Design a protein around this ligand. Structure first.
Ligand SMILES: Nc1nc2c(ncn2[C@@H]2O[C@H](COP(=O)(O)O)[C@@H](O)[C@H]2O)c(=O)[nH]1
Ligand SMILES: Nc1nc2c(ncn2[C@@H]2O[C@H](COP(=O)(O)O)[C@@H](O)[C@H]2O)c(=O)[nH]1
Ligand SMILES: Nc1nc2c(ncn2[C@@H]2O[C@H](COP(=O)(O)O)[C@@H](O)[C@H]2O)c(=O)[nH]1
Lengths: 327, 337, 317, 338
């Protein structure tokens, strides 16, 4: 070493989905919901497996309320005080499932996590996000959380390789968050030169996780519905959206609108603005209501299935044949 | 699966046509007309095989009138009332061959289609356009239209693979419309991640269709005459132009001028304006087309001369005295970028 | 078939020149002149083998006068009247070698060509430019011009393949003009979809021509000195510049100034080449770059450049 | 001839670093310092191996003062008069190690170089920069400097191939400056068509140098910390920054301000503004006549440094290298499409 990996890793861009013979009625005959039985928490899931990322500007209760109307999952950002949770939980009883409480490895975070899980029981999911998901320190933090909440479904990331995927599933995690570099506000590649193309990561990781009867989440990398579809077809059980959800009303950030061409604030989770307030800080153009964007995404996914012959999202990858595009 | 296909599919951009020794006089000695004998309708065709797409903004009678002056085909959009057809057919007797009536799988559409074919018996061509040309529901619908009009030449699409090409040809269609994703106002790839590079599609499909003694239409993907040339050389029997024809006088769209620059709208068969402007029944017609803007091009008149002109040169350059020989003489060179 | 060619043809952009160990003093110890003995006209050449393209806006006498100060060749555009030639020839006796009279296959053209060659015997070069250099109508015409002027060095193009290169050399031409598509004001690819990457063309054609003891000219495709260097290293005997020379004082076109900057029309497509001022500097800039290329590769003479060339493939750059 | 090289050379852009399981605490548990024992000068080094390029606008004493606070090396541009050196050396006693005196092959240059090395013996590094580092001439100049200062660590460049790397190491140089073309103000490729992708160059050259127990410097090509990281992982012992350091306060160039934004001129070593500003003798200093450009004013280098070192620290955490030495040893490059 250093040695170069012969096989070229490809991204969503380098690929397309080949249409296939089917018997599907209309795009409406498509069921975008899925039933999962998590390996470790032994719990069950049901709903459209698209998650709003646990970023300050995206994982907001205001956001969760809408995604809930469509059965979409939400990983609430790790900032809301125990009070807002109880408040939200109060005004939105039903939308408590399909919601995850986030947390880092930090003691403060873990203590703020317990507090919330103890207070609101309707929340059976935990979202663990460390800097380097390949850190032994993380593997242990994961186990610990496993023991302390043996019946909560655990989402832990991020990684981009099958190996660390298995390690984490065995050390206790239920869903592994796949993705390093391809994020919108994410800039690992510029600042560290470390990364891994989403598509190749998802395919490789999804495979690993599935062998252990576990699941993965395609975290970051999507800019359009097609990518989300590509992600699902690649094997992702859940697709987590960050930037694609930023810039809406229900979204976070300051509506610092420029010459008609309005721009809302969008800081990463470890950004310069997140640090100073509690990663790049960018201006996502105001997109209005998430309401439509969700209909637009689910809409696209529905078509993808029709085109491929999958009556239900579960059949999507099973019927997926990726074609390689020049550019 | 999933499985990634090893072979990289390439587009018009990834390729060029290699010049070849010939004995051609001048670009004028080139005949861009073709004679076809359709497999199922058993009918015959003759004219330049370039079709104006059946999009609201392109497949207009106003457009058809001009293309007619040059022998180009027109797939009239699925909106004109039986009256306008009647009118058009009236004022332009001759231009009724080389004209196709379009339709979706919807009952309303099919009833409106019959009405037109019964009324104007010069329109011998039908253009069937479904969302997913891979659905059995389409194969089915095609079968029906075949029976109901056993002697009309049927154009049905779209697909991008030889298999579904054969399926449709056997199911009764005469010409298969090839193309998914590459369209201008088309955005299948962005919204669904589904697509297929035009060049590879055309080559693969053209081959399939030809084996069953059928034909194909390269639908969408062309932005310049060279692409149309590339398409023909790739084996396409007909090349259908959409965006390349949008933005003209005879074209449709709103003259939404901007910054001392005259533009024109471009959406098509499945967009928000298609849904808005149509009584309903277009949602599953094509992805949901993007309503893009196209700078005002003036008269199609020129553009046509510009296209036919380019195709003529392509043939001169390759040694094809007639379009029929273009692909026969085509050798594609791969470009790095 | 129709078949796709497996081997990917690459352009100047897809490649670079690998530095090499040498004993060269300074960039000044580099000789950019070359001696050629043309296969058919049996004539001889000597000077820097870079030619100003025979385009209306580039192959001007005004341009030729300057390039002459540096030993560069000029293919005069086929428009100047027999009078201007006689005048130019008059005021610039010496600059008559390293000058070519251009012409198409058209009878009118050939007539005007004769008149000029007859009137000015100090011009020993003809530049034949047809639309499709692959047409038999051209091979023939070439054969004719050969007979009618058995001792003039003939430049004929364009083509992009070794085959047609040989055909033309045997048909009588001395230098084959290589290039279809890559031109600046050239837009063959957009309108016809026909073309061929310069680098691959030059390499392939240069090889062909050289086997028959003939020569080629890399016509079009260069945008910077490095490209010209790349072309020479690729095997081109002469490099013909069109756009890179447009937009100067001595250049043609109309100085259509806009929004604060000065531009000029370049003529296919009609494009605006921002006014660059005097060709004078551009020439020194080009020769300069070629000189460095040789130093870095170890070629003391332009003749050794390709001999010492190893192209590295680049992802981009 | 000529022939095209089959193997495609790739740049920093065509690649990424694959994360790896590790036992690292936090990004803080990473040591970015390295100990080197130079092959010829037999001297020793210790500090963070990132060097500020010896360009007029970057290798300034003002710059050196700050980089010194972080243990970064500085190749002082070859213009400062013997007086300024004296002064700098005076007011900043400690910051003399980790500083190199630059010079071209020109007599004037060498004459000036001696004068500085004699006056300030605390300066134990020499930076030799010729136009074409492949000229047998340079090789000789190198051998001469070796003899005249048998105990100074010599940095000589630039080249991009293992062969010339060995030649130079054997002729006497300690560190070989790798890089031709990829520079910011560098424009070798546009004017000469000559170049070589940084990544491939560094890997190939680093290997060569290391076999002879020598070292290399990745010169130019970096635009972000990730590139610097990529360079180190690729095998570079030192990474020299030019453009990434231009446009700061401590930087050189003219502090222009236009359209409400403040900038700084960033001219090359052989640029036109260099030849016109310099006394003479810089025309063959670097492989091409550099372009003068406007780098947007970046403020204090102070921060940029913390930002770079910061990024490198993360790269190591991600890969499992506790010490910068282990970075390449643990590096696996994933080839990327885009
Ligand atoms: N490395 C890094 N990743 C971030 C940061 N902020 C957000 N992310 C990642 O970006 C993901 C969303 O990606 P997106 O949908 O915007 O392409 C989040 O789920 C998270 O994993 C950050 O500041 N640094
Ligand atoms: N998926 C999709 N395709 C469309 C839509 N409108 C037009 N198209 C396709 O785009 C083709 C024209 O492509 P173009 O010549 O603009 O590149 C039309 O012939 C039709 O096949 C649409 O709304 N959705
Ligand atoms: N060829 C050439 N290289 C230069 C010139 N000026 C600076 N350089 C190179 O640019 C390198 C720094 O590259 P950067 O950090 O801007 O990408 C310097 O170390 C030096 O080797 C110049 O004028 N010509």
């Amino acid at each position: 070493m250093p040695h170069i990996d012969n096989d070229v890793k490809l991204d969503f861009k380098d690929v397309l989905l080949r249409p296939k013979r089917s018997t599907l009625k209309s795009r409406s005959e498509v069921d975008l919901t899925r039933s999962f039985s998590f390996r470790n928490s032994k719990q069950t899931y049901s709903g459209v497996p698209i998650i709003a990322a646990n970023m300050d500007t995206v994982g907001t209760f205001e956001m969760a309320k809408v995604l809930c109307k469509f059965s979409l999952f939400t990983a609430v950002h790790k900032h809301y005080s125990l009070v807002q949770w109880q408040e939200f939980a109060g005004q939105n009883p039903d939308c408590l499932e399909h919601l995850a409480a986030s947390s880092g490895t930090g003691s403060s975070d873990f203590e703020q996590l317990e507090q919330i899980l103890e207070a609101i029981p309707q929340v059976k999911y935990i979202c663990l996000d460390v800097a380097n998901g390949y850190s032994e320190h993380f593997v242990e933090f994961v186990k610990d959380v496993r023991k302390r909440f043996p019946q909560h479904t655990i989402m832990a990331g991020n990684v981009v390789t099958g190996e660390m995927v298995e390690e984490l599933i065995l050390s206790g995690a239920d869903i592994i968050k796949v993705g390093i570099g391809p994020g919108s506000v994410c800039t690992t590649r510029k600042k560290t030169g470390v990364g891994y193309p989403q598509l190749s990561a998802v395919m490789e990781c999804a495979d690993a996780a599935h062998g252990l009867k576990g699941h993965i989440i395609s975290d970051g990398g999507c800019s359009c519905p097609g990518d989300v579809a590509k992600a699902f077809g690649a094997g992702a059980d859940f697709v987590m959206l960050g930037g694609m959800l930023a810039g809406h009303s229900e979204s976070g950030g300051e509506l610092i609108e420029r010459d008609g061409k309005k721009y809302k604030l969008f800081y990463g989770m470890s950004s310069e603005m997140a640090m100073k307030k509690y990663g790049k800080t960018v201006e996502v153009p105001f997109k209005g209501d998430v309401e439509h964007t969700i209909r637009d995404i689910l809409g696209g996914i529905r078509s993808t299935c029709t085109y491929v012959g999958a009556a239900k999202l579960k059949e999507l990858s099973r019927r997926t044949t990726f074609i390689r595009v020049t550019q």
